Design a protein around this ligand. Structure first.
Ligand SMILES: CCCCCCCC/C=C\CCCCCCCC(=O)OC[C@H](O)CO
Ligand SMILES: CCCCCCCC/C=C\CCCCCCCC(=O)OC[C@H](O)CO
Ligand SMILES: *C\C=C(C)/C=C/C=C(C)/C=C/C1=C(C)CCCC1(C)C
Ligand SMILES: CCCCCCCC/C=C\CCCCCCCC(=O)O
Ligand SMILES: CCCCCCCC/C=C\CCCCCCCC(=O)O
Ligand SMILES: CCCCCCCC/C=C\CCCCCCCC(=O)O
Ligand SMILES: CCCCCCCC/C=C\CCCCCCCC(=O)O
Ligand SMILES: CCCCCCCC/C=C\CCCCCCCC(=O)O
Ligand SMILES: [Cl-]
Length: 258
């Protein structure tokens, strides 16, 4: 049901798509080590936040590594072009990985925002439930990205309603709680929010490639878009989240931080 099956791929497009997926694997398992090492320099209050990045890094690296092997098993160079052989490559694997990493990415945001008790459990439920609705409706629409572009749009519209509400919650919790953050992190968190608004919006852009660029280069463009957003929403995001966690741990008196 995905457009990846409709086209033959020259050796250049195929190996380029293969090098984007495997490169992601290394970048994510490389950042994992980093997020693993610096956790000792994070006070216990925020130490959970860096651990979630470690979880996020592994969750993403396993699907990318799976996507790569699934990419090289499904196609075979025949008569000058890589042609589909078996059907085992699908973007759906991504959406099942967003269901897991998105909650972890949202959790670590609220942890550095210094929410606790009622609000943490409450804000986390509406956000996770809001995201899960976004990812699921979007997963139903991409099943029609080959057959019914109309349905892709309709489900894309619904999915965007969830996305809009989610950010309003995130943005509202941020701008109303940054005055409680230490070490000047009240300024850095605002940038992280703008880092979110940009990196997260690249996903719907790739979601619509079947609609405005239906060809083998649109598939290369999609993975390139997924790759850019994936490194920003998870790696750079986790790094930015780590720094805020460390910076505040230092201002709170934690000696390792500091
Ligand atoms: C369908 C729209 C339903 C939207 C209803 C979502 C209301 C819950 C909510 O947004 O909570 C945010 C608040 O800041 C946390 O307590
Ligand atoms: C189906 C297509 C529907 C398309 C619909 C498009 C409308 C999107 C408009 C705004 C996005 C909201 C972005 C969230 C910005 C958060 C700002 C905020 O939360 O408000 C300020 C805060 O309260 C300070 O205290
Ligand atoms: C890896 C981290 C994240 C946050 C992945 C996020 C994915 C999205 C925000 C996807 C959004 C979509 C929308 C807004 C509507 C079209 C369908 C999508 C699910 C791709
Ligand atoms: C330095 C620490 C980070 C590096 C550790 C990970 C090393 C490389 C992992 C590459 C795995 C990719 C498998 C390719 C799948 C395939 O195309 O067949
Ligand atoms: C219905 C599914 C969604 C359920 C709501 C999610 C609940 C989120 C609660 C926290 C998950 C992470 C547990 C660690 C909390 C960190 C507390 C701390 O050390 O400050
Ligand atoms: C484990 C994931 C499931 C969690 C269920 C709770 C989240 C509810 C979120 C929004 C409702 C999504 C239901 C959409 C179903 C329509 C698709 C279809 O017709 O098959
Ligand atoms: C959560 C559910 C949100 C709204 C679902 C509306 C989309 C249903 C489109 C069905 C496609 C069709 O059969 O024509
Ligand atoms: C993801 C973005 C979701 C919004 C998609 C755009 C909303 C619908 C716009 C116009 C629909 C035009 C339908 C043309 C016929 C399609 C077959
Ligand atoms: Cl991704």
């Amino acid at each position: 049901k995905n457009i990846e099956s409709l086209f033959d791929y020259s050796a250049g497009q195929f190996e380029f798509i293969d090098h984007l997926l495997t490169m992601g694997v290394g970048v994510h398992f490389a950042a994992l080590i980093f997020f693993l090492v610096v956790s000792q320099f994070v006070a216990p209050k925020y130490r959970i936040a860096t651990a979630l990045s470690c979880i996020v890094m592994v969750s993403a690296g396993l699907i990318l590594n799976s996507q790569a092997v699934m990419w090289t098993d499904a196609y075979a160079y025949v008569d000058g072009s890589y042609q589909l052989q078996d059907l085992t490559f699908s973007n759906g694997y991504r959406y099942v990985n967003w269901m897991a990493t998105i909650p972890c990415l949202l959790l670590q945001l609220l942890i550095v925002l210094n929410l606790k008790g009622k609000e943490l459990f409450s804000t986390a439920t509406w956000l996770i439930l809001a995201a899960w609705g976004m990812i699921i409706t979007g997963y139903v629409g991409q099943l029609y990205e080959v057959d019914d572009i109309a349905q892709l749009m309709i489900w894309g519209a619904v999915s965007t309603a969830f996305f809009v509400v989610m950010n309003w919650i995130v943005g509202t919790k941020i701008f109303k709680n940054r005055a409680t953050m230490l070490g000047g992190t009240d300024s850095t968190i605002t940038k992280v929010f703008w880092l979110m608004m940009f990196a997260w919006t690249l996903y719907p852009i790739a979601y619509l490639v079947p609609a405005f660029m239906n060809n083998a280069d649109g598939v290369v463009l999609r993975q390139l878009l997924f790759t850019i957003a994936d490194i920003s929403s998870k790696v750079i995001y986790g790094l930015m989240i780590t720094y805020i966690a460390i910076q505040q741990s230092a201002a709170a008196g934690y000696v390792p931080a500091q």
